[PDB]
């Protein structure tokens, strides 16, 4: 449901998006509710910090190698919810 | 009976709700200490 | 030596369909469930007692 964008050849740890602040989920309840990346919609270019609910760059984004966008999913328990993030890469 | 305690002022009228499984309702209401018997003839319910 | 076997079978959540709600008609000591299901769906009934 989320739509984010990144520039071309960003660096590791650079900001991409804030999942919790955009979805309205409470930040301090992420650990008790089990905020975690869905094992299916995983990418080798973007990872999210579990505590802050912030998705950032894990590996340098190669525009030629990945291509056309990237997809990721998060899941939360008690209550059980699933969310999808789609990220554009510029040229 | 549905309810347990009733507010009571003086020389008045109150109402209570109850459930039973018998066609006859011959039973004892203990209104606030003492007993009082009650008689009825109940009907079968419409809903199965 | 030993190598890891990757792709660990991990728990997750995943959606399942919710079937059309049955139409219950009530007759004496019983109920008739009118059921619509495009795909095969499981119906399980039990009695709330000794047997």
């Amino acid at each position: 449901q989320l739509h984010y964008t990144v520039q071309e050849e960003q660096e590791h740890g650079t900001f991409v998006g804030n999942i919790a602040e955009d979805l309205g989920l409470d930040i301090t309840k992420l650990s008790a509710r089990g905020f975690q990346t869905v094992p299916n919609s995983r990418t080798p270019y973007l990872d999210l910090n579990l505590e802050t609910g912030v998705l950032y760059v894990n590996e340098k984004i190669d525009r030629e190698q990945i291509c056309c966008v990237l997809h990721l999913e998060v899941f939360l328990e008690n209550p059980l919810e699933l969310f999808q993030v789609e990220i554009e890469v510029l040229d | 009976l549905k309810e347990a305690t009733t507010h009571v002022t003086a020389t008045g009228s109150i109402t209570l709700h109850f459930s039973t499984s018998s066609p006859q309702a011959n039973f004892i209401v203990s209104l606030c200490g003492k007993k009082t018997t009650c008689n009825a003839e109940c009907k079968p319910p419409a809903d199965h | 030596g030993k190598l890891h076997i990757p792709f660990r079978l991990t728990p997750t959540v995943c959606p399942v369909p919710l079937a059309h709600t049955p139409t219950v008609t009530k007759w004496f000591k019983g109920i008739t469930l009118h059921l619509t299901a495009t795909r095969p769906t499981l119906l399980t009934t039990r009695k709330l007692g000794l047997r």
Side-chain angles (χ1 to χ4, degrees):
Chain A
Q1 321 99 338
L2 277 296
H3 163 259
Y4 292 148
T5 187
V6 298
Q7 296 157 358
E8 201 191 0
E9 293 83 4
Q10 293 179 176
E11 293 179 353
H12 173 89
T14 44
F15 180 76
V16 176
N18 206 315
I19 304 177
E21 278 177 1
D22 292 339
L23 267 167
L25 315 171
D26 187 21
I27 297 89
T28 188
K29 298 293 183 182
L30 287 193
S31 300
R33 184 176 178 179
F35 192 63
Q36 195 183 355
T37 300
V38 169
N40 290 318
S41 300
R42 269 207 216 276
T43 187
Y45 286 80
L46 294 174
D47 291 331
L48 71 84
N49 189 359
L50 295 175
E51 293 179 353
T52 49
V54 167
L55 188 153
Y56 53 87
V57 160
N58 193 40
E59 203 200 7
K60 178 166 289 291
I61 297 169
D62 201 2
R63 179 66 178 86
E64 197 197 353
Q65 208 264 358
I66 69 189
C67 182
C68 64
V69 285
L70 282 72
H71 317 283
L72 172 153
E73 272 178 342
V74 301
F75 75 101
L76 297 97
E77 300 147 354
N78 290 318
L80 294 174
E81 280 170 358
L82 188 153
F83 304 105
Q84 318 168 230
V85 187
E86 195 171 4
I87 303 106
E88 183 178 1
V89 181
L90 277 296
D91 185 33
Chain B
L1 283 172
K2 175 165 200 100
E3 303 79 12
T5 60
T6 300
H7 187 273
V8 65
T9 73
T11 176
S13 278
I14 62 170
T15 187
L16 282 294
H17 300 272
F18 76 109
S19 66
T20 187
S21 64
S22 65
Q24 65 183 357
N26 290 318
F27 63 93
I28 297 169
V29 176
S30 47
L31 169 59
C32 184
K34 46 211 179 283
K35 294 181 176 67
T36 288
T37 198
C38 300
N39 283 33
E41 294 293 328
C42 314
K43 297 296 289 183
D47 207 1
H48 308 276
Chain C
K2 314 202 151 53
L3 282 155
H4 282 118
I5 297 185
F7 321 118
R8 175 201 180 63
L9 188 153
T10 51
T12 187
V13 299
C14 63
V16 303
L18 275 183
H20 190 38
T21 285
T23 304
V24 194
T25 47
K26 296 182 289 294
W27 43 267
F28 196 32
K29 293 182 183 293
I31 45 163
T32 295
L33 297 155
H34 300 95
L35 306 188
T36 300
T38 294
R39 301 267 165 171
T41 54
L42 199 50
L43 180 69
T44 50
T45 68
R46 60 159 164 193
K47 294 181 176 67
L48 295 174
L50 183 63
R51 184 176 176 87

